Design a protein around this ligand. Structure first.
Ligand SMILES: [Cl-]
Ligand SMILES: [Cl-]
Ligand SMILES: [Cl-]
Ligand SMILES: [Cl-]
Lengths: 183, 173, 176, 174
């Protein structure tokens, strides 16, 4: 993309050490809309481009996680399908959850990328190696992030984030060559 | 700045539902049951406004259990549905809270919101409100309804009252 | 513009297609085959105001669903025809019954099946994202897209043409 | 473009991906796992007119749902292949059966699994919001986004290339 080709020196550098990529759900994997039916059940919407991006990222050896303040079986099903290894729902204390996971995984903050959209993501965004916000994240989150995606949440922002990491790590060309003969 | 001045005095913030907390779309299934959409940025904003001590209400000409549940999840204190005459509802609530019109902010989107918008301290329209409503409002949000308009309104009041910094500090330690 | 205002004066019947005009043109299907449809609140208010001014309303759609019957009833739309591809035939029958001529009809459409009606009526308009061929042959095009207040815009155009919008707005300047 | 008009002349089979082409790329899931999908009215009309002009149609999707089976039947799409991410393998088998060649195929895609087909066929096109790498390597890109009339635009490009759009429009001006 033009985003991976014009990726800043800073984001390219920050992408090098990444071993773990973490996503919030609402506003990142979705457009931030919450659909409710009369019985109180929810409908959730995700984006076709993001699944492909996450799959390519995982294939490159980067493990993935979701930390969400909300909880629904829709997300559990979505994550399992994609191959996301670590899912934490119903947690607004995102930093507490992250710390426990990094201790288990033996990783430092610099080895973590995170893509968020609102205030509860901020304590994590400020501390990780690659802390990014989607294009329509709360402006206060955008101002304190290392980078912002061109795409909006739920419209390929996760895909863009995945490709930034792949590109930073020298792995995007190989991922593309699976699909383009003589690339 | 007129809007910031209007915001200082606010003690009650009032929202319409369809077109303000939602994008104005009404979803119906074949048996007539409804689906409605809200926005996560809005929820965070309303929670922060409420935590600052500004109380909140909804007044809507429609009625659905969907809205009752959403209001409770957000901690919206006062909910009135199925009400055509919004000024009548507001007047009664104001007597209960011992407030006047100047201490009320309202975020609306169509004609039945206008009798209220014109009379309160901070009467605002969403970006895609009916043009006649926008014409008569004190201000118009950049955001469309259901797309963070309510978040923007909440932050306007928080900021007018010197409370946005403290809301934000919770996340910056 | 001044031509649309002129064409609006004579209107006694306003007719809508459903999908792409009162909706954004998305068709929602569930696994079990049933549908979901989305309408817009600004449009509802518009249609109610147009009806109150004395202009009757109708829907002619090629699709058929009980969702549309319910919506039409909620809004006070008097004449409803679904599952009808031959829109000009439907309209001609209705016009003979209401004793109205083409010049007294306004129609808001979005695709080719609407074109024969759009070309014959007094105020034949297309929504902003109607098929371009339809937009090219309509008397006018709404600024709003289908399902996003295009019907409201169309209703306000007719109310305005007849000098009735001012009064409809006036109610909402007063208190109770 | 005159290049696209040229490529469109020989088309006898037009093939679509589903998600992101016939839809805006949103995947709706209810708590019980059942899905909802949205199609576009303008697209349905376009596909019906294409089929009427003599061009057969097909869908090849890496996902799989009865929703797509019903939508395909409603539009008269003859050849439907779901749950297939090896798209050239599917297409090769279909062409052998129909006795058609790559030069007679148009394909409208949105993401990487579509790219091998897009590169092989006579008219490989991407939707406006296709993955940028796919857009860069297609013959052409629709002005319209997926699920917002891109399929209609693609249908009309073929109809026009084959001198058939006027005649389709006529039914509506008599
Ligand atoms: Cl996916
Ligand atoms: Cl929320
Ligand atoms: Cl309505
Ligand atoms: Cl259709």
């Amino acid at each position: 993309s033009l985003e991976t080709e014009t990726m800043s020196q800073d984001l390219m550098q920050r992408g090098k050490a990444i071993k773990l990529a973490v996503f919030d759900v609402d506003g990142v994997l979705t457009d931030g809309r919450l659909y409710f039916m009369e019985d109180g059940s929810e409908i959730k919407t995700f984006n076709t481009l993001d699944g492909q991006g996450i799959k390519m990222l995982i294939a490159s050896g980067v493990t993935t996680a979701i930390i969400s303040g909300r909880k629904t079986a829709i997300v559990e099903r979505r994550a399992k399908s994609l191959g996301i290894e670590h899912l934490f729902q119903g947690r607004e204390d995102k930093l507490v959850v992250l710390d426990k996971l990094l201790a288990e995984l033996q990783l430092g903050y610099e080895q973590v990328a995170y893509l968020g959209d609102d205030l509860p993501d901020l304590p994590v965004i400020r501390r990780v190696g690659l802390g990014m916000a989607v294009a329509n994240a709360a402006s206060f989150v955008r101002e304190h992030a290392h980078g912002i995606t061109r795409a909006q949440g739920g419209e390929g922002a996760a895909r863009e984030f995945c490709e930034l990491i792949l590109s930073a790590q020298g792995n995007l060309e190989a991922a593309h060559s699976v699909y383009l003969e003589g690339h």
